[PDB]
C-alpha cells in the first residue's frame, strides 16, 4: 500500500468500483479501500434491472441522467470482459410493467410519448408471456430496461481497474478523512495514505464521512428482502414489474424475485414476514411461481436520502473531496454515468450543468 | 464387505440404524446397506417430536406401542452417547397443543383422563408462554411429548452400532433380494451378500422390496416442507402444536417450524407456495415469529401407507424376511420400539401379540 | 405421466438430457425419467472441458467421434438459448497442455501435425500466461478444447426439450424394464409406462439395467474430487492442463480446479486427503493459486467401463433398447454426438459404422 | 434505543456478550452495540478449547487468571441455559498434548507437578486413543482443558443478558466515543446515547477507540484458518493438540481442525495454501483424518497486541471508560473472568491487584 495516490476511492460497491475503473482509465494513479469484499454489500442484493423508466415520473434531469447511463451500458459488457474475463451476464429480454387497475394504466400511459416504450393490451401481453397473471389490464413494454447481475458488473469493473493499474484494498475500512494540509489524509487500520482527491462511495454508510467533513447530509437505510426460485417449467423472457416489485428471469434458469421496503432497518438478513410478503406478491404476478423450488433468500440496504436522489458531486468548500452516494434503487443503472461524472469532475473536464446541479451536495 | 452376515438391514434412516444397533446389541453379526448417507433422507427432515399424544385418537395398540417407545427414550441419549460420543440433543420443555376453537377443545380434552396430560386455560398458557397467540381457547400440556434432533439420534445409533461390531455401508443401494436357496441373497452394485435374516427399512422406498417378495403393500409419499428461524428475542421453552403444525424450540436458539402435506409429491425440496403456507400458519401460533430471521428451508417424504400405520413384522410366508416401514409422522418416536421389536422377532423372543398383530404385513 | 410414449429415456444427466432434446427435435413423443434432479450427479461435478485432444494419442474412431462432437458444439449454445433462455456459459480461451519434462515434450509434440494445435516454448507460454509455473518446458496450445458449465448445458438441453414437447419426470426412479409384450414396459414408483424405444442413460448406475436385460456389462465408479477458488488478482484466459489435472477459469472469475482418481469409491463428497492432493497439484501448475480464496469443494463419480470407453448403441438382441453410458472423462464433450447418434439409431437413420462399432455393447 | 444507559458495551463478540451478562446480573441498566450480528466475527471461528494449560510455561499472573476463568466455567453452562435455553455444548473429554520429539517431552513434562495434569507414555496414549499418530513419544493429559462451542457460549450470554434487561442492538456500529460532558457520549448511525460507563470490547477492531481516546495501543490481526470433517468411523474423545494446532471432536460427530497463523492478514476467508497446511498438519496428528469427509472451512482474526496479552481495565485518565480486547488465543477461556473483572471494576468492587496490573492499558 503506497503512501500517496493521486486519487482515493472509499467504498468498493458497484459505485466505487465504477469510479476506480474510469479514474484508472484516465491513467490516474488511484487506490480503492473497501471495508469487506468488493461488492459484498447492497450491490450483491440488487436485482440488476437497468430501470431508467422506473423513475421517469417528471422528465427532469434525474431521468435524463438515468437514460444517459442506460445508454452507457451499450458495449460495456464487451469492454469490461476484454480486460477482466468477467461476464456481466446481461439479459436483453426487456420489461413488462404490469397494470392491475385503471390507476396503474393511467400511471403507465403517462410515458407513451417516449420511444421504445409501447403499451400492450391484456391479450398482447399474454401472447408474449402466457403465464403472467390474467388479472392484468395490460402492460407497458420497456425494451431497454434490461438486466445484468450486479455482483459481476462490480467484479468486472474492479478486475478491469486492476489491470489498468488501480490498487484495490479489501478488508481495509477507512476510519477518517483529514482535509488538513495541502493534500488529503485518510486513516485506515492498515496504514494511512495521502491523496490529491478523495471520493466517498460508501453507500448507505457514507453519512459518517459527510459529518466528518462538516456536512449534514443524512442517509436512511430502506431494507429490501428477496428470494430466488428455479424456473424449470415455463417460458419467461421478460421481466415482470409491478409496484416496485419484480420477477426477473436470469440466464441461469433462476428467477430473482422481490422486494420489501423496510425504512430504518439496518439488518441485512430477511425476516419471515418479509419473505412471506414477497412470495405472496410474486404469486399475483406470476401464478405458477408458487410451484417453483426455492433457491436462496437475502436482503440489502438501499441508500435512502432526504429527497430520494443521490449526491454526486464536489464538497461545497473543497473541490478535492467528491461524493457519490444515495442511489436508492437505481445504483446498478447509474454506475456508469456516476463513475464517468465523478471521473470528469476530478479530471476537471466540462460536464452537464443540469446533472451537476441536480445531484449537488448542498441541495435545499 | 463380507460374503455372509447373520442379519442384513436395508436402509440407513433412523429405523434401519435403530434396528442395526439392537441387533449388534444382541451380538448378532449384522450389516446395513444405505443408498446414500446415514439418515440423509426423511429422517433429516423430521422435527424430532416424541409425539405419542398426537396419535392417541382411539387408545388402541398403536397408541400403546407409541407410549412404550416414548418410555424407551428414557436414558437412551445417555446410553448411545457412551458408545458414540454423539449427543441426540434432547429438549424436555414439553408441549402445548393449542386450541383455537371449541372443536379443538373437544378434540384435546378427549385425553384429560391420561396422566402427564393436563388442560391449561388461555391465561395459564400465556403465563408460561406470553408470546403464544392470544386467540387461543387454551391448550393441552403434554409434558412427555419432548423432542430430539433426528439426524443425531440416527448418527448416534449408527456410531454405537459400529462400536458394537455392526458393519455399515453407505453409498451401497440394494438392488434385489432373492429368498431362493436356504439363505437370503441380496445384490448391490458393490457386490452380493448372503444372510440368514433380511430387514427392509427403506422408508417410503420400501415398496420395491415388498413387490419383489410377492407382496402388494404400497407406499405413498406425503411431502412436508419446513423452515427454521433464529429466535434471539423471546422466551420459548415449550413446543407449540396445532393441526399437525408446529414450532419447536431447539437448544441452539433456532425454531424448527412446520409442515405442509403434499400427497403423491416425491420431490424433496420446498416449493414457494408451501413455504409461504408454513410461514402464514406459524404466525397465527407465534405472532413474533414474523420478525425472526430465516435460517434454512427443507422438505422430506413421509412414508404413507393405506391405513396410516407402519408395517413392522415378518413376511407372511418367510420368517427370515422382516419389514419396518411406513412410520407416517411417528418415525423418530417409534425408532426404539420398532428397533427392539424387529430385534426380538429375529432373536425369536416373545413379543407383545397385540403390537405384532397391529403392525402385521398382511393387514386387511 | 401418460401411459404410453414413443421413446423413454432413463437418467437425466447431460447424456439423457441431450438424448431427449434430439428425440423431441425429431418430433418423437418422448419421456425422460430421472431419480433425482436433472444433471444432479456426475454431470454437475465435471469441469466442462471439451477435451477432444486428450484422446488423440491414437487417431482412431474414438478421436474422430470426439472431434465430431466438438464441432457439434459450434452454435449449440445459441440454438439451446433460443429455446431455453439458459446460457451454457462457453469460454473460448483455449487450452495449454503443460510439459514439466522432456518426456512430456516428446509426447505433446506428437500432435504438432494436428490443426488448431501448436507447440509453444517455455517463454512463449509465459508470454500469454505469465503466472503459469516457471518450471514448465513449454506447452501445446489447443485452441478448440474450450469449456462450458456442464450443469447449464444439461439444463439448457432439458428445458429446450420441454419446450419441444418432451415430458420430464424428476424424482421418478425407474425400477425395472420389461421386454415381453410387443412394446417395452417401464416400472416406476409413480406408475408403469409402455414405450416403443427405451434408452438407458443412467451413467455409472446403468449396470442394473444391463443385468436386468441379460447383459453383464460392468460399471465401476472412479471418484473425482475438485474445488474452486476466486481468482481476483491475476489474469488467466487459457485452461491449464497436465496429467489429467486442470485449472479452468470461468467467466465468473472462479477457477475450477482438480481431480483425484479413485476407482471403486461410490461416495460423492470429497475427503481431506483428496482435496489436499488437488491443492498440491494445482500449486505446481499455477503458483499464485496458493493465495486465492477457496470457494467450494465437491466430487463426482466417473462411470468406468472395462476399457474406459462408453457403450453407445442398441441391445444386441433387441433394437428397441439402447444404451448410452460409460463416458469416463468425456461425457460433456461427447454429449451432442452421443445424443444425435442415439436419436438417429431410433429414427433408424443411417449412421457411421465405425463409430457404431467402436461403442458396441457386446465388445468381446 | 433509549437516550441514556448506565453502561454501554461496544462489540458483541463473546467478550462483549459476557460483559453485558454480568452487568445485567448486577442490575445495571446496560446496552450493547454490535456492528453486525452477535458473535459473528472471531468468536465464531474459535475452536472453543478452555486452554488454561497453554499458558503455564510460566506460572505467573496470566496463568492464574486463566485457571480462574476455567473454574468460572464450572456450572456456567447450566446457569446460562436456565436463562437462555441455549446449550453451550460443553465436552469434557479432556486434552492430549502430544509430543513428537524428546524436546517436546522435556517441555511437556515441566507441568507434571500440576494437578489434573499427568504424563502418558506412547503406549498409554494409544491405549486411550488408538488412532493417534504412532509417531508420538507420548503426551501430557490435561483433564480440565475441555471445550465448548464459542458461538453458542456467546448466544447464551447475550440471550441471558436480554432476559435480565440488557438492551442489545445488532447492526449498530459505534462511530465515536465522546468524553467531554460529565457522562460519555456514544454516536451511532441509529442515533446518539449517553452513558456513565463505556466498555470497548470490539476485538481486533478496538484500536480506533483507543486512538479516539488518546491512547496508541495497537492491534494486529493474526488470521487463523480452519476446517471441519465428519468423523463417522473412529473413536476420538480427547482433543489432540500440538504446536498450537488441534483436532477437537464435537458432540455432533464433527472434528474441528486447525489453525494457521498469519499476522497482518485482515481477510476472513481461508485461502488454498492455508487450508492445505492445516490438512497436512492434521494428518501428522491423526492419520485416519485423511479419509474423512470435509464439512466446512473458515477463518478468523485473532486480536494481537504488542505482547500477545489482552488489555482489560480502565482508561488511565478516565475510570468511566474501560477496555477488554486483545485475547490472542484465549478469548473463549477468558470470557467469564474478563466479564466478571470488567463488571466488578464498574461496580467499583474490590479486585485482584495482580490481575489488574497484568492487563494494564498503559503497559510501558
Ligand atoms: C432488494 C434490492 C433490489 C435492488 N434492485 C436494483 C435494481 O434492479 N437496479 C438498480 O439499479 N439498483 C437496484 N438496487 C439498488 C442498488 O443495489 C444500490 O443503489 C447500489 O448497490 C448502491 O451501490 P453503492 O456502491 O453506492 O453501495 P454498496 O453496494 O452498498 O456498497 C458500499 C460499499 O462501501 C463499503 N464501505 C462502507 N463504509 C466504508 C468505510 N468506512 N471504508 C471503506 N468501505 C466502506 C461497504 O462495505 C460497501 O462495499 C436494489 C437494492 C435492493 C436493496
Ligand atoms: C416435515 C416432516 C416432519 C416430521 N416430524 C416428525 C416428528 O416430529 N416426530 C416423528 O416421530 N416423526 C416425524 N416425521 C416422520 C419421520 O421423519 C419418519 O417417519 C422417519 O424419518 C422414517 O424413517 P425411516 O428410517 O423409515 O425412513 P427414511 O428416513 O426416509 O430413510 C429410509 C432410508 O433407506 C434408504 N434406502 C431406500 N431405498 C434403498 C435401497 N434400495 N437400498 C438401500 N437403502 C435404500 C434411503 O436412502 C434412506 O436413508 C416427520 C416427517 C416429515 C416429512
Ligand atoms: C471431477 C470430474 C471432472 C470431469 N471433467 C470433465 C470434463 O472437463 N469434460 C468432459 O467431457 N467430461 C468430464 N467429466 C465426466 C463427465 O462428468 C461425465 O462423463 C458425464 O457427467 C456423465 O453423464 P451421464 O449423463 O452419463 O451421467 P450422470 O451425470 O452421472 O447422470 C446419470 C443420471 O441418471 C440418473 N439415474 C441413475 N439411476 C437411475 C434410475 N434407475 N432411474 C432414473 N434415473 C437414474 C442419475 O440420478 C443421474 O442424474 C468429469 C467427471 C468428474 C467426476
Ligand atoms: C482459528 C482460531 C481458533 C481459536 N481457538 C480458540 C480456542 O480454542 N480457545 C480460546 O479461548 N480462544 C480461541 N481463539 C481466540 C478467540 O476466538 C478470540 O480471543 C475471541 O473470539 C475474541 O473475542 P472478542 O469478543 O474480543 O472479539 P470478536 O469475536 O472478534 O468480536 C468483536 C466484536 O465487536 C464488533 N465490533 C467491531 N467494531 C465495532 C464497532 N465500531 N461498533 C460495534 N461493534 C464493533 C465486531 O463486529 C465483533 O462482533 C481462536 C481464534 C481463532 C482465529
Could you give the CA distance from residue A73 to residue A52 in angstroms, rounded to a whole number? Answer: 12
Q: What three-state secondary structure class fits B252?
A: coil
Domain ranges for chain B: 1-91+145-218+306-364, 92-144+219-305
- The count of other CB atoms within 10 Å of the CB of residue D115 is 7
DSSP string, B155-200: HHHHHHHHHTT-EEETT----EEE--SSSEEEEETTEEEEES-EEE
State how far residue C226 is from chain B, nearest Cα, in angstroms.
19
Q: Look at residues C315, C307, C313, C323 and name the one whose alpha carbon lies nearest to residue C355.
A: C313
- Residue whose entry in the numeric block shows the C-alpha cell 449537488: A360
Contact between B312 and B324 (Cβ < 8 Å): yes
The distance from CA A25 to its chain's CA centroid, rounded to whole angstroms, is: 21
CA distances from A310 to A41, A204, A215, A305, D215 (A): 18, 11, 15, 7, 37
Separation of first and last alpha carbons in chain C: 39
Q: Is the Cβ atom of D36 under 6 angstroms away from ligand 4?
A: yes
CA distances from D9 to D21, D35, D79, D203, D340 (A): 11, 12, 22, 12, 14
Flag if A294 and B282 touch (Cβ within 8 Å).
Answer: no
Question: Which residues are CB-contacts of A56 (< 8 A; sequence separation ≥ 6)?
Answer: A63, A66, A111, A114
The distance from CA C161 to its chain's CA centroid, rounded to whole angstroms, is: 19
- Residue whose entry in the numeric block shows the C-alpha cell 478444447: C145
- Residue whose entry in the numeric block shows the C-alpha cell 467484479: A155
Q: Look at residues D245, D187, D258, D211 and name the one whose alpha carbon lies nearest to residue D45.
A: D258
Could you give the CA distance from residue D241 to residue D248 in angstroms, rounded to a whole number? Answer: 8
Q: Is the Cβ atom of B174 under 6 angstroms away from ligand 2?
A: yes
Could you give the CA distance from residue C284 to residue C134 in angstroms, rounded to a whole number? Answer: 9
Q: Is the Cβ atom of D249 under 6 angstroms away from ligand 4?
A: no
Flag if C279 and D282 touch (Cβ within 8 Å).
Answer: no
Nearest to A266 among D172, D207, D267 (CB): D172
Flag if D159 and B232 touch (Cβ within 8 Å).
Answer: yes
Question: Rounded to 10 degrees, what is the CA torsion of D133, D137, D141, D146?
Answer: -40
CA distances from C335 to A18, A332, B25, C303 (A): 40, 38, 50, 14
Flag if B267 and A229 touch (Cβ within 8 Å).
Answer: no
Contact between C324 and C200 (Cβ < 8 Å): yes
Beta strands in chain D (DSSP E): 4-10, 30-33, 95-99, 117-121, 138-142, 167-169, 176-178, 184-188, 191-200, 220-230, 239-242, 245-249, 254-258, 262-263, 293-304, 311-315, 318-325
The nearest alpha carbon in chain C to A153 belongs to C252
Flag if A253 and C163 touch (Cβ within 8 Å).
Answer: no
Determination technique used: X-ray
- Residue whose entry in the numeric block shows the C-alpha cell 487417431: C59
Cell digits of residue A139: 402492460
* DSSP class of C344: H
State how far residue A266 is from chain D, nearest Cα, in angstroms.
6
Could you give the CA distance from residue D145 to residue B284 in angstroms, rounded to a whole number? Answer: 46
Is B174 a known ligand-binding residue?
yes
Q: Is the Cβ atom of D305 under 6 angstroms away from ligand 4?
A: no
Which residue puts its alpha carbon closest to atom 45 of ligand 4? D11
φ/ψ region of B266 (left if φ > 0, alpha if ψ in -120 to 50, else beta) reads alpha
Is C329 a known ligand-binding residue?
yes
Cell digits of residue D67: 485457571
Q: Which of C255, C265, C272, C292 to mutate to test binding with chain D, by most D CBs within 10 Å of its CB?
A: C272
To test the ligand 4 pocket, which listed residue (D149, D190, D209, D329) has its Cβ within 8 A of the most ligand atoms? D329
- The count of other CB atoms within 10 Å of the CB of residue B180 is 8
Is C41 a known ligand-binding residue?
no
Contact between C18 and C7 (Cβ < 8 Å): no
Cell digits of residue D170: 445488532
Flag if D275 and C293 touch (Cβ within 8 Å).
Answer: no
Could you give the CA distance from residue B85 to residue B34 in angstroms, rounded to a whole number? Answer: 22
Is C319 a known ligand-binding residue?
no
The distance from CA C15 to its chain's CA centroid, rounded to whole angstroms, is: 8
* Chain A residues whose beta carbon lies within 8 Å of the beta carbon of residue B271: 290-294
Ligand nearest to the CA of A15: 1
Question: Which residues are CB-contacts of B113 (< 8 A; sequence separation ≥ 6)?
Answer: none
Contact between D47 and D226 (Cβ < 8 Å): yes
Contact between A303 and A326 (Cβ < 8 Å): yes
Q: Which of A87, A94, A154, A169 to mutate to test binding with chain C, by most C CBs within 10 Å of its CB?
A: A87
Ligand nearest to the CA of D270: 4
Stated resolution in angstroms: 2.3
CATH number for the domain whose boundaries are A1-91+145-218+306-364: 3.50.50.60
Q: Is the Cβ atom of A248 under 6 angstroms away from ligand 1?
A: no
Buried b (16+ CB within 10 A) or exposed e, B114-136: beebebbebeebbebbebbbeeb
Topology of domain A92-144+219-305, per CATH? D-Amino Acid Oxidase; Chain A, domain 2 (3.30.9)
DSSP string, D13-26: SHHHHHHHHHHHHT
Question: Which residues are CB-contacts of D58 (< 8 A; sequence separation ≥ 6)?
Answer: none
D37 Cα nearest atom in ligand 4 = 49
Nearest to B267 among C171, C207, C267 (CB): C171
Neighbours, chain C (3 or more CB pairs < 8 A): A, B, D
**Within chain D, where are the H helices?**
14-25, 42-45, 61-72, 76-84, 102-109, 122-128, 150-163, 207-212, 272-285, 335-346, 353-358
Could you give the CA distance from residue D58 to residue D114 in angstroms, rounded to a whole number? Answer: 12
Question: Which residues are CB-contacts of C202 (< 8 A; sequence separation ≥ 6)?
Answer: C10, C11, C13, C16, C174, C208, C209, C325
Could you give the CA distance from residue D205 to residue D15 in angstroms, rounded to a whole number? Answer: 13
* DSSP class of A353: H
Could you give the CA distance from residue B337 to residue B356 in angstroms, rounded to a whole number? Answer: 12
Buried b (16+ CB within 10 A) or exposed e, A247-283: bbbbbbbbbbbbbbbbeebbbbbbbbbbbbbbbebbb
Could you give the CA distance from residue B67 to residue B86 in angstroms, rounded to a whole number? Answer: 25
- The count of other CB atoms within 10 Å of the CB of residue C182 is 8
Contact between C31 and C9 (Cβ < 8 Å): yes
Cell digits of residue B233: 428475542
Give the H/E segment covering residue A186: strand A184-188
Nearest to B237 among D85, D89, D162 (CB): D85
For residue B12, how far is its CA from the centre of ligand 2 (angstroms)?
A: 9
Ligand nearest to the CA of C12: 3
Q: Is the Cβ atom of A258 under 6 angstroms away from ligand 1?
A: yes
Nearest to B235 among D87, D163, D233 (CB): D163
Q: Look at residues A89, A171, A299 and name the one whose alpha carbon lies nearest to residue C253.
A: A89
Buried b (16+ CB within 10 A) or exposed e, B181-209: eebbebbbbbeebbbbbbbbbbbbbbbbb
- Vertex A45 angle, CA A41 and A51, to 5°: 120
Contact between C197 and C315 (Cβ < 8 Å): no
Could you give the CA distance from residue D190 to residue D174 in angstroms, rounded to a whole number? Answer: 9
Judge residue D134's burial from the number of C-beta atoms within 10 Å of its C-beta, 0-12 exposed, 13-18 middle, 19 or more buried: exposed
Nearest to C252 among A93, A152, A237 (CB): A152
- Phi, psi angle pair for D281, to nearest 5°: -60, -50
Could you give the CA distance from residue A125 to residue A285 in angstroms, rounded to a whole number? Answer: 12
Could you give the CA distance from residue B145 to residue B115 in angstroms, rounded to a whole number? Answer: 12
Is C14 a known ligand-binding residue?
yes
Report the DSSP beta bridge partners of residue B141: B96, B118
* DSSP class of A293: B
Report the DSSP beta bridge partners of residue D296: D228
Ligand nearest to the CA of C331: 3
Beta strands in chain B (DSSP E): 4-5, 7-10, 30-33, 95-99, 117-121, 138-142, 167-169, 176-178, 184-188, 191-195, 198-200, 220-230, 239-242, 245-249, 254-258, 262-263, 294-304, 311-315, 318-325
State how far residue C259 is from chain D, nearest Cα, in angstroms.
15
Amino acid at each position: 500500500m503506497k503512501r500517496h495516490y493521486e486519487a482515493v476511492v472509499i467504498g468498493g460497491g458497484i459505485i466505487g468500483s465504477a469510479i476506480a475503473y474510469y479514474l484508472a482509465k484516465e491513467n490516474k494513479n488511484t487506490a480503492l479501500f473497501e471495508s469487506g469484499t468488493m461488492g459484498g454489500r447492497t450491490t450483491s442484493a440488487a436485482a440488476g434491472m437497468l430501470g431508467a423508466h422506473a423513475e421517469c415520473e417528471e422528465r427532469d434531469a434525474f431521468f435524463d441522467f438515468a437514460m444517459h447511463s442506460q445508454r452507457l451500458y451499450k458495449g460495456l459488457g464487451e469492454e469490461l470482459y476484454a480486460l477482466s474475463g468477467v461476464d456481466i451476464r446481461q439479459h436483453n429480454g426487456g420489461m413488462f410493467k404490469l397494470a392491475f387497475s385503471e390507476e396503474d394504466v393511467l400511471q403507465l400511459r403517462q410515458m407513451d410519448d417516449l420511444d421504445s416504450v409501447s403499451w400492450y393490451s391484456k391479450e398482447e401481453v399474454l401472447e408474449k408471456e402466457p403465464y403472467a397473471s390474467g388479472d392484468i389490464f395490460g402492460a407497458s413494454f420497456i425494451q431497454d430496461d434490461v438486466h445484468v447481475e450486479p455482483y459481476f458488473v462490480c467484479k468486472a469493473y474492479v478486475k478491469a481497474a486492476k489491470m489498468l493499474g488501480a490498487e484495490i484494498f479489501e478488508h481495509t475500512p477507512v476510519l477518517h478523512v483529514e482535509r488538513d494540509g495541502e493534500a488529503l489524509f485518510i486513516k485506515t487500520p492498515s496504514g494511512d495514505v495521502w491523496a490529491n482527491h478523495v471520493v466517498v462511495a460508501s453507500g448507505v454508510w457514507s453519512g459518517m464521512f459527510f459529518k466528518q467533513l462538516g456536512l449534514n447530509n443524512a442517509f436512511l437505510p430502506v431494507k429490501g428482502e428477496c428470494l430466488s426460485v428455479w424456473n424449470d417449467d415455463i417460458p419467461l423472457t421478460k421481466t415482470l414489474y409491478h409496484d416496485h416489485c419484480y420477477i426477473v428471469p436470469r440466464k441461469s434458469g433462476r428467477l430473482v424475485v422481490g422486494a420489501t421496503m423496510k425504512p430504518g432497518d439496518w439488518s441485512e438478513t430477511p425476516d419471515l414476514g418479509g419473505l412471506e410478503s414477497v412470495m405472496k406478491k410474486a404469486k399475483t404476478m406470476l401464478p405458477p411461481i408458487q410451484n417453483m423450488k426455492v433457491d436462496r433468500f437475502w436482503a440489502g440496504l438501499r441508500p435512502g436520502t432526504k429527497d430520494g436522489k443521490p449526491y454526486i458531486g464536489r464538497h461545497p468548500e473543497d473541490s478535492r473531496i467528491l461524493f457519490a452516494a444515495g442511489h436508492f434503487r437505481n445504483g446498478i443503472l447509474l454506475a456508469p454515468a456516476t463513475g464517468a461524472l465523478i471521473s470528469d469532475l476530478i479530471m476537471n473536464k466540462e460536464v452537464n450543468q443540469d446533472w451537476l446541479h441536480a445531484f449537488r451536495i448542498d441541495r435545499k
